[PDB]
RNA sequence: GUUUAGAACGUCGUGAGACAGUUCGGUCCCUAUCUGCCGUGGGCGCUGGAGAACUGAGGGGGGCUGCUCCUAGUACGAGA
Protein backbone atom coordinates (compact mmCIF):
# COMPACT_ATOMS: atom_id res chain seq x y z
CA UNK A 1 0.00 0.00 0.00
CA UNK A 2 2.33 2.66 -1.25
CA UNK A 3 0.84 5.99 -2.32
CA UNK A 4 0.41 6.68 -6.03
CA UNK A 5 -0.09 9.91 -8.00
CA UNK A 6 -0.53 9.49 -11.75
CA UNK A 7 0.46 11.88 -14.53
CA UNK A 8 -1.20 11.80 -17.95
CA UNK A 9 1.84 12.08 -20.21
CA UNK A 10 1.90 12.73 -23.96
CA UNK A 11 -0.89 15.28 -24.11
CA UNK A 12 0.43 16.94 -27.27
CA UNK A 13 -0.98 14.25 -29.57
CA UNK A 14 -4.71 13.64 -29.95
CA UNK A 15 -5.90 11.96 -26.76
CA UNK A 16 -9.06 10.13 -25.90
CA UNK A 17 -11.71 12.47 -24.51
CA UNK A 18 -10.12 12.93 -21.10
CA UNK A 19 -13.21 12.51 -18.97
CA UNK A 20 -13.82 8.88 -19.84
CA UNK A 21 -10.07 8.41 -19.47
CA UNK A 22 -10.38 9.49 -15.85
CA UNK A 23 -13.36 7.18 -15.37
CA UNK A 24 -11.54 4.28 -17.03
CA UNK A 25 -8.67 4.76 -14.62
CA UNK A 26 -10.78 5.00 -11.52
CA UNK A 27 -12.85 1.98 -12.36
CA UNK A 28 -10.79 -0.45 -14.46
CA UNK A 29 -7.90 -0.37 -12.00
CA UNK A 30 -9.75 0.44 -8.80
CA UNK A 31 -7.92 3.33 -7.23
CA UNK A 32 -10.37 6.23 -7.37
CA UNK A 33 -9.11 9.57 -8.76
CA UNK A 34 -9.36 13.26 -8.05
CA UNK A 35 -7.81 15.64 -10.59
CA UNK A 36 -5.70 18.66 -9.75
CA UNK A 37 -5.17 20.11 -13.22
CA UNK A 38 -7.42 20.07 -16.23
CA UNK A 39 -6.16 20.64 -19.79
CA UNK A 40 -7.68 23.21 -22.12
CA UNK A 41 -8.24 21.04 -25.17
CA UNK A 42 -5.86 18.48 -26.69
CA UNK A 43 -3.85 17.84 -29.81
CA UNK A 44 -3.09 20.61 -32.28
CA UNK A 45 -5.05 22.99 -30.02
CA UNK A 46 -3.80 22.10 -26.54
CA UNK A 47 -3.44 25.62 -25.12
CA UNK A 48 -2.89 25.48 -21.38
CA UNK A 49 -3.72 23.81 -18.10
CA UNK A 50 -6.16 25.04 -15.48
CA UNK A 51 -5.09 24.34 -11.92
CA UNK A 52 -7.97 23.43 -9.63
CA UNK A 53 -6.56 24.42 -6.20
CA UNK A 54 -4.38 27.41 -7.20
CA UNK A 55 -7.46 28.56 -9.25
CA UNK A 56 -5.31 29.99 -12.06
CA UNK A 57 -4.47 28.96 -15.59
CA UNK A 58 -1.17 28.56 -17.39
CA UNK A 59 -0.19 28.77 -21.05
CA UNK A 60 1.98 26.59 -23.26
CA UNK A 61 4.25 27.48 -26.17
CA UNK A 62 5.23 24.60 -28.42
CA UNK A 63 8.73 23.72 -29.53
CA UNK A 64 10.37 24.90 -26.30
CA UNK A 65 10.75 21.48 -24.73
CA UNK A 66 14.47 21.77 -24.21
CA UNK A 67 14.56 24.40 -21.45
CA UNK A 68 12.41 25.40 -18.50
CA UNK A 69 10.09 27.99 -20.00
CA UNK A 70 8.61 30.97 -18.20
CA UNK A 71 5.04 30.65 -16.99
CA UNK A 72 2.38 32.97 -18.37
CA UNK A 73 -0.61 33.11 -16.05
CA UNK A 74 -4.16 34.27 -16.75
CA UNK A 75 -5.17 33.92 -13.07
CA UNK A 76 -8.87 33.56 -12.38
CA UNK A 77 -11.43 31.32 -14.06
CA UNK A 78 -14.12 33.70 -15.23
CA UNK A 79 -11.60 36.42 -16.06
CA UNK A 80 -12.54 37.46 -19.62
CA UNK A 81 -8.85 37.86 -20.38
CA UNK A 82 -8.87 34.07 -20.61
CA UNK A 83 -11.75 33.91 -23.06
CA UNK A 84 -9.76 36.40 -25.12
CA UNK A 85 -6.55 34.40 -24.63
CA UNK A 86 -7.84 30.89 -25.34
CA UNK A 87 -11.09 31.77 -27.08
CA UNK A 88 -14.69 30.66 -26.69
CA UNK A 89 -13.51 27.66 -28.67
CA UNK A 90 -12.54 25.92 -25.44
CA UNK A 91 -13.36 28.20 -22.52
CA UNK A 92 -17.10 27.56 -22.74
CA UNK A 93 -16.26 23.86 -22.79
CA UNK A 94 -13.94 24.25 -19.82
CA UNK A 95 -16.61 25.82 -17.62
CA UNK A 96 -19.16 23.05 -17.87
CA UNK A 97 -16.51 20.32 -17.94
CA UNK A 98 -15.27 21.57 -14.58
CA UNK A 99 -18.74 21.88 -13.13
CA UNK A 100 -19.45 18.35 -14.34
CA UNK A 101 -16.29 16.88 -12.80
CA UNK A 102 -16.23 18.78 -9.49
CA UNK A 103 -19.75 17.68 -8.61
CA UNK A 104 -19.38 14.09 -9.78
CA UNK A 105 -15.84 13.31 -8.59
CA UNK A 106 -13.89 13.40 -5.35
CA UNK A 107 -11.76 16.02 -3.62
CA UNK A 108 -8.28 15.76 -2.14
CA UNK A 109 -7.35 15.04 1.49
CA UNK A 110 -3.79 14.07 2.35
CA UNK A 111 -4.62 11.48 4.98
CA UNK A 112 -6.81 9.45 2.65
CA UNK A 113 -4.01 9.75 0.11
CA UNK A 114 -1.57 8.07 2.45
CA UNK A 115 -3.46 4.79 2.30
CA UNK A 116 -4.13 4.23 -1.41
CA UNK A 117 -7.79 5.18 -1.98
CA UNK A 118 -7.38 8.54 -3.74
CA UNK A 119 -4.68 9.31 -6.27
CA UNK A 120 -4.43 12.83 -7.69
CA UNK A 121 -3.61 13.24 -11.35
CA UNK A 122 -1.58 15.87 -13.15
CA UNK A 123 -2.03 16.40 -16.87
CA UNK A 124 0.82 17.69 -18.97
CA UNK A 125 3.19 16.86 -21.78
CA UNK A 126 6.64 15.40 -21.32
CA UNK A 127 8.14 16.71 -24.53
CA UNK A 128 6.63 20.08 -23.88
CA UNK A 129 8.27 20.31 -20.47
CA UNK A 130 4.95 21.60 -19.25
CA UNK A 131 3.19 19.53 -16.63
CA UNK A 132 6.39 18.38 -14.93
C1' G B 1 38.82 10.02 -89.40
C1' U B 2 38.04 8.80 -94.48
C1' U B 3 40.09 9.52 -99.98
C1' U B 4 46.11 11.05 -104.03
C1' A B 5 51.40 11.14 -104.67
C1' G B 6 56.74 8.60 -99.96
C1' A B 7 57.93 4.26 -96.87
C1' A B 8 57.68 -0.46 -93.86
C1' C B 9 55.00 -5.07 -91.54
C1' G B 10 51.39 -9.58 -91.95
C1' U B 11 48.99 -11.93 -96.07
C1' C B 12 48.15 -12.89 -101.68
C1' G B 13 50.45 -13.31 -106.70
C1' U B 14 56.15 -15.82 -110.63
C1' G B 15 55.56 -10.39 -111.44
C1' A B 16 53.86 -5.19 -112.14
C1' G B 17 50.93 -4.68 -107.87
C1' A B 18 46.64 -5.62 -104.13
C1' C B 19 43.87 -6.07 -99.05
C1' A B 20 36.55 -2.00 -95.47
C1' G B 21 44.27 -5.33 -92.39
C1' U B 22 47.64 -2.45 -89.56
C1' U B 23 51.57 1.48 -89.07
C1' C B 24 54.73 6.92 -89.57
C1' G B 25 54.39 11.90 -92.91
C1' G B 26 51.11 14.86 -95.79
C1' U B 27 48.77 23.04 -99.38
C1' C B 28 41.12 23.67 -96.81
C1' C B 29 40.26 30.20 -101.83
C1' C B 30 36.26 34.28 -102.14
C1' U B 31 36.62 42.60 -101.24
C1' A B 32 28.45 40.55 -100.62
C1' U B 33 24.82 42.55 -106.37
C1' C B 34 19.68 40.58 -104.81
C1' U B 35 16.52 38.07 -100.76
C1' G B 36 17.16 37.64 -95.15
C1' C B 37 18.69 39.63 -90.33
C1' C B 38 21.02 43.39 -86.77
C1' G B 39 21.65 48.91 -86.10
C1' U B 40 21.28 54.03 -88.06
C1' G B 41 19.83 58.08 -91.43
C1' G B 42 17.52 61.10 -95.99
C1' G B 43 12.55 62.18 -99.11
C1' C B 44 7.57 62.78 -99.29
C1' G B 45 2.94 62.19 -96.99
C1' C B 46 -0.64 62.99 -93.02
C1' U B 47 -4.83 69.31 -96.49
C1' G B 48 -2.15 76.85 -93.45
C1' G B 49 2.73 76.78 -90.78
C1' A B 50 5.58 75.64 -86.07
C1' G B 51 7.18 73.80 -80.57
C1' A B 52 6.15 70.17 -76.92
C1' A B 53 3.36 66.56 -73.96
C1' C B 54 0.48 62.24 -74.59
C1' U B 55 -3.15 58.05 -76.14
C1' G B 56 -2.54 52.96 -77.38
C1' A B 57 -3.89 49.29 -82.60
C1' G B 58 0.03 46.19 -82.43
C1' G B 59 5.06 43.75 -81.28
C1' G B 60 8.97 42.00 -78.23
C1' G B 61 11.37 40.77 -73.40
C1' G B 62 10.80 37.92 -68.57
C1' G B 63 8.60 33.18 -66.47
C1' C B 64 14.18 28.14 -63.61
C1' U B 65 14.97 25.92 -58.84
C1' G B 66 17.72 23.57 -54.20
C1' C B 67 18.58 23.19 -48.83
C1' U B 68 17.11 25.16 -43.55
C1' C B 69 13.59 26.47 -39.72
C1' C B 70 8.11 27.15 -37.55
C1' U B 71 3.43 24.18 -37.82
C1' A B 72 6.06 19.31 -35.56
C1' G B 73 8.70 14.87 -34.35
C1' U B 74 2.01 16.79 -35.00
C1' A B 75 -1.66 13.55 -38.58
C1' C B 76 -0.53 8.27 -39.81
C1' G B 77 1.74 4.20 -37.40
C1' A B 78 2.12 -1.72 -32.82
C1' G B 79 6.86 0.22 -33.62
C1' A B 80 10.94 1.86 -37.07
N1 LIG C 1 5.42 14.04 -28.07
C1 LIG C 1 5.87 13.33 -27.02
N2 LIG C 1 6.32 12.08 -27.21
C2 LIG C 1 6.73 11.50 -26.06
C3 LIG C 1 6.73 12.05 -24.79
N3 LIG C 1 7.23 11.14 -23.87
C4 LIG C 1 7.53 10.08 -24.59
N4 LIG C 1 7.25 10.23 -25.92
C5 LIG C 1 7.45 9.25 -26.98
O1 LIG C 1 8.14 8.15 -26.43
C6 LIG C 1 9.54 8.18 -26.83
C7 LIG C 1 10.41 8.01 -25.61
O2 LIG C 1 9.97 6.85 -24.86
P1 LIG C 1 10.55 6.63 -23.38
O3 LIG C 1 9.90 7.60 -22.45
O4 LIG C 1 12.04 6.58 -23.44
O5 LIG C 1 10.00 5.16 -23.05
P2 LIG C 1 10.45 4.06 -22.00
O6 LIG C 1 9.35 3.85 -20.99
O7 LIG C 1 11.80 4.41 -21.45
C8 LIG C 1 10.62 2.51 -22.96
P3 LIG C 1 10.82 1.02 -21.96
O8 LIG C 1 9.44 0.54 -21.61
O9 LIG C 1 11.57 0.03 -22.81
O10 LIG C 1 11.61 1.42 -20.74
C9 LIG C 1 9.71 9.49 -27.61
O11 LIG C 1 10.65 9.34 -28.67
C10 LIG C 1 8.30 9.75 -28.14
O12 LIG C 1 8.03 9.05 -29.33
C11 LIG C 1 6.25 13.37 -24.60
O13 LIG C 1 6.18 14.01 -23.54
N5 LIG C 1 5.83 13.95 -25.80
MG1 LIG D 1 41.05 12.98 -98.90
MG1 LIG E 1 52.49 4.00 -102.18
MG1 LIG F 1 57.03 15.80 -91.20
MG1 LIG G 1 33.48 45.30 -103.51
MG1 LIG H 1 16.92 37.88 -105.40
MG1 LIG I 1 20.51 43.19 -99.66
MG1 LIG J 1 15.46 47.76 -90.43
MG1 LIG K 1 16.52 55.69 -82.28
MG1 LIG L 1 11.77 59.16 -91.26
MG1 LIG M 1 -0.18 46.95 -76.92
MG1 LIG N 1 7.63 37.00 -75.87
Swiss-Prot record:
Gene name, please? prfC
Per the entry, what this protein does is:
Increases the formation of ribosomal termination complexes and stimulates activities of RF-1 and RF-2. It binds guanine nucleotides and has strong preference for UGA stop codons. It may interact directly with the ribosome. The stimulation of RF-1 and RF-2 is significantly reduced by GTP and GDP, but not by GMP.
Subcellular locations according to the entry: Cytoplasm
This one is known as Peptide chain release factor RF3
Which residues does the annotation say bind GTP? 9-12
Family, as annotated: Belongs to the TRAFAC class translation factor GTPase superfamily. Classic translation factor GTPase family. PrfC subfamily.
Lineage: superkingdom: Bacteria
Question: Transmembrane stretches, by residue range?
Answer: none
